[PDB]
Design a protein around this motif. Structure first.
Motif, PDB file in Angstrom:
ATOM      1  N   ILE A 196     -58.657  17.246 -46.457  1.00 49.89           N
ATOM      2  CA  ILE A 196     -57.866  17.987 -45.463  1.00 49.89           C
ATOM      3  C   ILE A 196     -56.629  17.215 -45.066  1.00 49.89           C
ATOM      4  O   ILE A 196     -56.743  16.081 -44.817  1.00 49.89           O
ATOM      5  N   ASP A 197     -55.498  17.898 -45.063  1.00 51.01           N
ATOM      6  CA  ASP A 197     -54.170  17.372 -44.704  1.00 51.01           C
ATOM      7  C   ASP A 197     -54.100  17.213 -43.197  1.00 51.01           C
ATOM      8  O   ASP A 197     -54.625  18.022 -42.501  1.00 51.01           O
ATOM      9  N   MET A 198     -53.449  16.178 -42.719  1.00 46.07           N
ATOM     10  CA  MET A 198     -53.406  16.051 -41.256  1.00 46.07           C
ATOM     11  C   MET A 198     -52.333  16.957 -40.692  1.00 46.07           C
ATOM     12  O   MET A 198     -51.270  17.092 -41.256  1.00 46.07           O
ATOM     13  N   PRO A 199     -52.512  17.427 -39.455  1.00 38.62           N
ATOM     14  CA  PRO A 199     -51.606  18.373 -38.840  1.00 38.62           C
ATOM     15  C   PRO A 199     -50.278  17.755 -38.421  1.00 38.62           C
ATOM     16  O   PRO A 199     -50.272  16.640 -38.082  1.00 38.62           O
ATOM     17  N   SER A 200     -49.202  18.523 -38.499  1.00 33.08           N
ATOM     18  CA  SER A 200     -47.845  17.978 -38.244  1.00 33.08           C
ATOM     19  C   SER A 200     -47.520  17.733 -36.768  1.00 33.08           C
ATOM     20  O   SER A 200     -47.112  16.618 -36.436  1.00 33.08           O
ATOM     21  N   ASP A 201     -47.749  18.715 -35.920  1.00 31.37           N
ATOM     22  CA  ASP A 201     -47.333  18.583 -34.510  1.00 31.37           C
ATOM     23  C   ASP A 201     -48.370  17.934 -33.618  1.00 31.37           C
ATOM     24  O   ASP A 201     -48.673  18.495 -32.616  1.00 31.37           O
ATOM     25  N   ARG A 202     -48.828  16.748 -33.963  1.00 31.43           N
ATOM     26  CA  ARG A 202     -49.764  16.028 -33.072  1.00 31.43           C
ATOM     27  C   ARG A 202     -48.939  15.302 -32.010  1.00 31.43           C
ATOM     28  O   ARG A 202     -47.780  15.125 -32.191  1.00 31.43           O
ATOM     29  N   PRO A 203     -49.523  14.837 -30.906  1.00 29.72           N
ATOM     30  CA  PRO A 203     -48.803  14.081 -29.915  1.00 29.72           C
ATOM     31  C   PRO A 203     -48.261  12.750 -30.427  1.00 29.72           C
ATOM     32  O   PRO A 203     -48.769  12.190 -31.295  1.00 29.72           O
ATOM     33  N   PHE A 204     -47.268  12.243 -29.756  1.00 32.69           N
ATOM     34  CA  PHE A 204     -46.651  10.975 -30.172  1.00 32.69           C
ATOM     35  C   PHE A 204     -47.641   9.833 -30.086  1.00 32.69           C
ATOM     36  O   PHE A 204     -47.537   8.975 -30.852  1.00 32.69           O
ATOM     37  N   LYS A 205     -48.505   9.848 -29.093  1.00 30.49           N
ATOM     38  CA  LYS A 205     -49.495   8.778 -28.903  1.00 30.49           C
ATOM     39  C   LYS A 205     -50.512   8.840 -30.035  1.00 30.49           C
ATOM     40  O   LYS A 205     -51.030   7.839 -30.358  1.00 30.49           O
ATOM     41  N   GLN A 206     -50.757   9.995 -30.616  1.00 30.73           N
ATOM     42  CA  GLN A 206     -51.727   9.998 -31.707  1.00 30.73           C
ATOM     43  C   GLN A 206     -51.044   9.656 -33.018  1.00 30.73           C
ATOM     44  O   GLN A 206     -51.754   9.238 -33.887  1.00 30.73           O
ATOM     45  N   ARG A 207     -49.728   9.785 -33.119  1.00 28.04           N
ATOM     46  CA  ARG A 207     -49.042   9.449 -34.364  1.00 28.04           C
ATOM     47  C   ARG A 207     -48.866   7.940 -34.489  1.00 28.04           C
ATOM     48  O   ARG A 207     -49.552   7.287 -35.278  1.00 28.04           O
ATOM     49  N   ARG A 208     -47.969   7.363 -33.704  1.00 25.04           N
ATOM     50  CA  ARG A 208     -47.699   5.934 -33.813  1.00 25.04           C
ATOM     51  C   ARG A 208     -48.714   5.133 -32.998  1.00 25.04           C
ATOM     52  O   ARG A 208     -49.158   5.557 -31.929  1.00 25.04           O
ATOM     53  N   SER A 209     -49.102   3.978 -33.523  1.00 27.01           N
ATOM     54  CA  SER A 209     -50.034   3.128 -32.804  1.00 27.01           C
ATOM     55  C   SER A 209     -49.398   2.595 -31.520  1.00 27.01           C
ATOM     56  O   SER A 209     -48.183   2.671 -31.311  1.00 27.01           O
ATOM     57  N   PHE A 210     -50.240   2.006 -30.667  1.00 23.59           N
ATOM     58  CA  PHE A 210     -49.755   1.498 -29.389  1.00 23.59           C
ATOM     59  C   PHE A 210     -48.834   0.306 -29.591  1.00 23.59           C
ATOM     60  O   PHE A 210     -47.851   0.150 -28.858  1.00 23.59           O
ATOM     61  N   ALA A 211     -49.112  -0.516 -30.602  1.00 26.82           N
ATOM     62  CA  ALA A 211     -48.235  -1.639 -30.901  1.00 26.82           C
ATOM     63  C   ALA A 211     -46.901  -1.156 -31.435  1.00 26.82           C
ATOM     64  O   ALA A 211     -45.853  -1.711 -31.091  1.00 26.82           O
ATOM     65  N   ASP A 212     -46.917  -0.114 -32.264  1.00 28.10           N
ATOM     66  CA  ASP A 212     -45.675   0.430 -32.790  1.00 28.10           C
ATOM     67  C   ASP A 212     -44.838   1.038 -31.674  1.00 28.10           C
ATOM     68  O   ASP A 212     -43.626   0.821 -31.610  1.00 28.10           O
ATOM     69  N   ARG A 213     -45.444   1.878 -30.841  1.00 20.34           N
ATOM     70  CA  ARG A 213     -44.739   2.379 -29.667  1.00 20.34           C
ATOM     71  C   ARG A 213     -44.143   1.244 -28.826  1.00 20.34           C
ATOM     72  O   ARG A 213     -42.977   1.305 -28.426  1.00 20.34           O
ATOM     73  N   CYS A 214     -44.915   0.179 -28.577  1.00 20.39           N
ATOM     74  CA  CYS A 214     -44.406  -0.931 -27.772  1.00 20.39           C
ATOM     75  C   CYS A 214     -43.251  -1.630 -28.483  1.00 20.39           C
ATOM     76  O   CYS A 214     -42.222  -1.938 -27.865  1.00 20.39           O
ATOM     77  N   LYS A 215     -43.436  -1.925 -29.777  1.00 16.84           N
ATOM     78  CA  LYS A 215     -42.365  -2.399 -30.653  1.00 16.84           C
ATOM     79  C   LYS A 215     -41.135  -1.501 -30.557  1.00 16.84           C
ATOM     80  O   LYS A 215     -40.003  -1.984 -30.430  1.00 16.84           O
ATOM     81  N   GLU A 216     -41.335  -0.182 -30.610  1.00 10.80           N
ATOM     82  CA  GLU A 216     -40.187   0.710 -30.591  1.00 10.80           C
ATOM     83  C   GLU A 216     -39.433   0.605 -29.264  1.00 10.80           C
ATOM     84  O   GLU A 216     -38.212   0.420 -29.247  1.00 10.80           O
ATOM     85  N   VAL A 217     -40.154   0.615 -28.143  1.00 11.11           N
ATOM     86  CA  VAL A 217     -39.487   0.477 -26.861  1.00 11.11           C
ATOM     87  C   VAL A 217     -38.803  -0.876 -26.768  1.00 11.11           C
ATOM     88  O   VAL A 217     -37.687  -0.983 -26.244  1.00 11.11           O
ATOM     89  N   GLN A 218     -39.420  -1.922 -27.305  1.00  7.96           N
ATOM     90  CA  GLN A 218     -38.800  -3.230 -27.181  1.00  7.96           C
ATOM     91  C   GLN A 218     -37.453  -3.254 -27.883  1.00  7.96           C
ATOM     92  O   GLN A 218     -36.443  -3.650 -27.295  1.00  7.96           O
ATOM     93  N   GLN A 219     -37.416  -2.798 -29.130  1.00  9.62           N
ATOM     94  CA  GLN A 219     -36.176  -2.819 -29.892  1.00  9.62           C
ATOM     95  C   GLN A 219     -35.059  -2.088 -29.167  1.00  9.62           C
ATOM     96  O   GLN A 219     -33.927  -2.582 -29.106  1.00  9.62           O
ATOM     97  N   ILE A 220     -35.373  -0.937 -28.564  1.00 11.76           N
ATOM     98  CA  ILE A 220     -34.377  -0.147 -27.846  1.00 11.76           C
ATOM     99  C   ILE A 220     -33.926  -0.873 -26.583  1.00 11.76           C
ATOM    100  O   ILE A 220     -32.741  -0.888 -26.246  1.00 11.76           O
TER     101      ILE A 220
END
Length: 122
Positions: A5-29
């Motif tokens: 089964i293919d994963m669904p496209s419109d999942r929430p942002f928190k379920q897509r990127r990991s917590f470290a990636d989200r934190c990494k992303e905010v840090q870079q910005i």
């Protein structure tokens, strides 16, 4: 004989990127544009009537207030001026339309450094 089964496209942002990636992303910005506010705007959990927009990550400058943001989202959703639209913070709070997004950030940002909003009708 596996059916995969293919994963669904419109999942929430928190379920897509990991917590470290989200934190990494905010840090870079934060390092690049430290006055800009990193905001995730997603469609409300069980909302049916309103479309899903295909930008959900918004980089908001310091003095923009909700009212500007609501007018931006209303237009992106190609909405009719008489269709009601509520942009909430956390998962249920309306904000005063006068408030600069930045004044909201420090009080409402998530653990990961993003400000999470959702939009709804009822």
């Amino acid at each position: 004989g596996w059916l995969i089964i293919d994963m669904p496209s419109d999942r929430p942002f928190k379920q897509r990127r990991s917590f470290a990636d989200r934190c990494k992303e905010v840090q870079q910005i934060r390092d690049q544009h430290p006055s800009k506010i990193p905001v995730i705007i997603e469609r409300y959990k069980g909302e049916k009537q309103l479309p899903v927009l295909d930008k959900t990550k918004f980089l908001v400058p310091d003095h923009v207030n909700m009212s500007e943001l609501v007018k931006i989202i209303r237009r992106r959703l190609q909405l009719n001026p008489t269709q009601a639209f509520f942009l909430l913070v956390n998962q249920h709070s309306m904000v005063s339309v006068s408030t600069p997004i930045a004044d909201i950030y420090e009080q409402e940002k998530d653990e990961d450094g993003f400000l999470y909003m959702v939009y709804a009708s009822q």
